Structure 1
Amino acid sequence: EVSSILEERIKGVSDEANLNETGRVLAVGDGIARVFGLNNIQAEELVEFSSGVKGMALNLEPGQVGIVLFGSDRLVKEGELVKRTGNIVDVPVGPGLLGRVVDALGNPIDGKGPIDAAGRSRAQVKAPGILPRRSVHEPVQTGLKAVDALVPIGRGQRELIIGDRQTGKTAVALDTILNQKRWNNGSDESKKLYCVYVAVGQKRSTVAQLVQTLEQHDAMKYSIIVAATASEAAPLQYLAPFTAASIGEWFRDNGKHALIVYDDLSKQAVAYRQLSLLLRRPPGREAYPGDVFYLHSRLLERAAKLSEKEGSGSLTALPVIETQGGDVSAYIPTNVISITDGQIFLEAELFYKGIRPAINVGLSVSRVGSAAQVKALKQVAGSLKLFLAQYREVAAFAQSDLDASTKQTLVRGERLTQLLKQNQYSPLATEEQVPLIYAGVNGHLDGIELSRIGEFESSFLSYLKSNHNELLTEIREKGELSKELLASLKSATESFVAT
């Protein structure tokens, strides 16, 4: 009992040490121990103090090496041996991180078990070249019709999620993982997206809810949750996306696919600000380092859909940037906006108007496009974009007397807006994405009252399954919409509108 624990603990200090190169603290202030020694010292090398804390050495000054502490100053005191671990920051990579909430070092903070790892690989690894890359054909499906069709996303792709926190910023991200559960079931490991959620500056109480939610929806078993909490030190926060990416490279390398969602790189920036200011390295615009751009570029360009040269595998990424007014002007947004391909712009107005989580999809864009979209889903959702496009313009005359054309647009558009509403943690199969957009396109939703859109949806889907889940199964398996199948589908929808 207490004894079993004692034996373990004593075993854990059994086997005498034998020191080598040390440094000694001259003075320690503000997480910047200034150490005399460490003559040889790799850059970004891990050094372990005699207070046991670990550090990296961002300033290698000529006669003293200004270590950056990954922890509290209380532990450190003057004249403290600072052993040189002699290993650049590395984190385990391997399948053992699957279903594990780990700290940056890789220690399971959920304590679900030690990481099975085939290597520990260094935190910052250079981006894969031009010729290692290949065009993205594979779509990634979030089970949200609007995201999958209006903002078509693939695998390898890096695309922004700029929006305001707690509007279910995390919820939008989580929804994808759940629809990816479907794909995960699908044997191929380009369909097994082993997702990585990088929780930056997020309190343990919140992250406890997240972990539990993932487990609830039984998705925490191909998940990895890299946790750098609000209180967790700024080196850990800074290197947390970098180290996390290295895990991602292992999946990508193995030809598998995975999705890494960095939430929020804004707090990664803030941590770097703390580091830089304390290292006296000048803070850039808005007191946020200027080579934060350089960091973001290195991190985000490791996300790639590889070619068969390096095996066709990928590392999808979805960085999340938190805005306080939608101020894209702000230095950290401007930089990230430039680096990312596509943007998702989630907006408050919609939230109030009952779309929760709320996305303004007029101000969302894709710059990777429908090449990462199902052919079927593309076919029956070109129309949708145009109707909605008109709807935006003709929403600016909606509030009376209106030409029939304008009024018609409003009828289809209001029904569509209601259909595109979605509530947290509801993923929806592609074989049910394809029918719903078709109905709206054919204006079959127009007749069924706005309030009755909700009723229409569930009923329509069940009716489609009853009438022809053969048709639905054809949509899924063929992956393409044969004219005969859309003919039948059109008839089916008409029949459903009738009852």
Structure 2
Amino acid sequence: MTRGRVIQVMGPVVDVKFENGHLPAIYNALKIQHKARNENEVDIDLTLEVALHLGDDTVRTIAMASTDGLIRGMEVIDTGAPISVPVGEVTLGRVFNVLGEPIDLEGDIPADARRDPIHRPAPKFEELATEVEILETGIKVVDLLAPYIKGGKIGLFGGAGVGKTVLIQELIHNIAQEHGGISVFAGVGERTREGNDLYHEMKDSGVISKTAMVFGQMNEPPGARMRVALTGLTMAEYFRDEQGQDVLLFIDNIFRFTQAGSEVSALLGRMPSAVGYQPTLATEMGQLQERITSTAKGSITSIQAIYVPADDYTDPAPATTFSHLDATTNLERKLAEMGIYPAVDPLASTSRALAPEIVGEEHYQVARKVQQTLQRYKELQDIIAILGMDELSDEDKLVVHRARRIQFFLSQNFHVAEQFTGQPGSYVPVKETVRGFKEILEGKYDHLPEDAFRLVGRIEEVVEKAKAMGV
């Protein structure tokens, strides 16, 4: 038997002293289970994760829940292993917290079910997969300018209130209902209201029978917010490895993991880094990101939403995250303010799949021509705002005329955005969007008013909208 005792409580960080030669290993889970001795105490059931060996038989830990109620001298139990969560068919259709305990009040998991440790090393260089295959989403801008890759890593960047969650929900709607494999959703430091809405939508649509959900939302302490992602990841890794299934992994906001680490860094006692982050930012990000990958045994295609603090794309967290992704979508409130949704930046967004030998020569040429036109339009705005439109050459006037229509046609009405747009959404095949943009570039629709191109879908809908407007 080996028991510790609490010696110091500083917010979410707790120090425990053990007997000599019986220290728990790093990342081991500790349990505090205290029954109130009298009316001046409260009952406690708390879980801790070991972080540092302070020396002198002392360990510094991070709590998975609120530390209010703790008293110095409380007994601590060492479980001898990291946090372990159930895996397998049992997890499908259920909703879990960070510790692997179901929260949907459908019943407890049997105590003899298999449980896997939260921490493991990343797959090796030998066992990776590098094939590139297009994943069609039905979204015009994504399918044209930055295609997604099956089994790859997709990141959605954006500041506060630009459309990351709406884009995630639209992707779930378009992809997960016919994927044919397994889907896992991880909520990391987001709104409980959004989590409840997504759960009820999935339950109504029937996808819930094929999905496992884990939630670590904003109200939770930093330890939970920084381990919920690993819980979801190990649940997905079981299906990748033991069954060879294709897995869809949606992460609600991966920036909160870094944010929680930075919240606890100073209390752990580490010197601050450049923008107030922890020194180990890159290493902590890599140890998590490198596990989310496809292997020979199975493929995981993952879509992650990444918050950009204060709209600054040079911030260390998004700047470090950029190197871990195969395809990238950049959202700008400059476009969001103008009424264009999903507000994707057509130039900053990149994808490894945009090559002539992957998407086709015609698709490649159309995409590059669209980007060239938009880039040219960007430069003209500075001189337009000063000297007016009349002083432009006829070529520049035509460039502006077509660029405005292209930028409006990159908008789309989503199914999950009826509450915001008042109209049902649309699904656009990639062949259709390529042909429509080719026709716009060729000038087939120069006579159409530019407002007819907003939030429509296929190119024929522009004609119908303009006819309704009386053109």
Output the TM-score relative to the length of structure 1: 0.77
1:252 paired with 2:252, answer: no
- The number of aligned residues is 431
In structure 1, how many angstroms separate the alpha carbons of the residues matched to 2:5 and 2:62?
A: 14
Contact 1:200-1:237 within 8 A present in 2 as well: yes
Counterparts of 2:455 and 2:80, CA distance in 1:
64
Distance 1:32 1:136, change over 3 A: same
Asked whether the equivalents of residues 3 and 77 of structure 2 are also in contact (C-alpha less than 8 Å), the reply is: yes
Distance (Å, rounded) in 1 between the aligned partners of 2:205 and 2:167 = 15
Q: Does 1:416 align with 2:382?
A: no
Q: Is the 8 A contact 1:101 1:109 kept in 2?
A: yes
Residues 417-456 of structure 1: per-residue CA shift (max 9 Å, x gap):
22221234367556x3312320220334445443444698
User: Shift of the alpha carbon at 1:121?
Assistant: 1.7
1:433 aligns with 2:434: no
**1:41 maps to what in 2?**
24
Structure 2 residue 266 is the aligned partner of structure 1 residue 283: no
Given the superposition, is the C-alpha separation of residues 118 and 416 from structure 1 closer, same or farther in structure 2, using an over 3 Å criterion?
Answer: farther
Structure 2 residue 8 is matched with structure 1 residue 24: no
Match for residue 228 of structure 1 among 201, 206, 216: 216
- What is the root-mean-square deviation in Å for CA atoms of aligned residues? 3.1
Find the aligned partners of 1:217 and 1:143 in 2 and give their Cα distance. Answer: 19
CA contact (8 A) 2:29 2:49 kept: yes
Q: 1:115 offset after TM fit, Å?
A: 5.4
Q: Percent identity?
A: 22
Residues 313-462 of structure 1: pairs in structure 2 closer than 5 A: 313-366=298-351, 368-370=352-354, 375=359, 379-380=362-363, 382-397=365-380, 399=384, 400-401=389-390, 402-425=392-415, 429=427, 432-443=429-440, 444-453=444-453, 457=457, 460=460
**Residue correspondence of structure 1 range 285-324 to structure 2 within 5 A:** 285-307=274-296, 311=297, 313-324=298-309
Gaps of 5+ in 2: 34-43, 417-424, 464-470
| Aligned counterparts of 2:162 and 2:401: Cα–Cα separation in 1 | 28
What does residue 124 of structure 2 align with? 129
Q: CA deviation at 1:41?
A: 1.9
Give, in angstroms, the shift of residue 47 of structure 1.
1.1
1:201 equivalent to 2:185? Answer no
After the TM superposition, which of the residue ranges 167-176 and 38-47 deviates more from structure 2? 38-47
| 1:158–1:300 CA contact under 8 A, matched in 2 | no
Amino acid at match of 1:345: N
The two structures have a TM-score, normalised by structure 2, of 0.81
The one-letter amino acid of 1:314's match is S
- The letter of the residue matching 1:267 is R
- Contact 2:136/2:430 (CA < 8 Å) preserved in 1? no
Secondary structure of the corresponding residue to residue 285 of structure 1: coil
Say whether 1:69 aligns with 2:66: no
Cα offset, 1:176, TM superposition? 1.2
How far apart in 2 are the matches of 1:372 and 1:99?
Answer: 41
Q: What is the identity, as a one-letter code, of the residue corresponding to 2:47? A: K
Higher alpha-carbon deviation: 330-339 or 345-354 = 330-339
How many angstroms apart in 2 are the aligned matches of 1:250 and 1:396?
50
Contact 1:141 1:176 in 2 (8 A): no
- One-letter code aligned to 1:53: L
More displaced 10-residue stretch of structure 1: 339-348 or 394-403: 394-403
Report the more deviating stretch, 123-132 or 397-406.
397-406
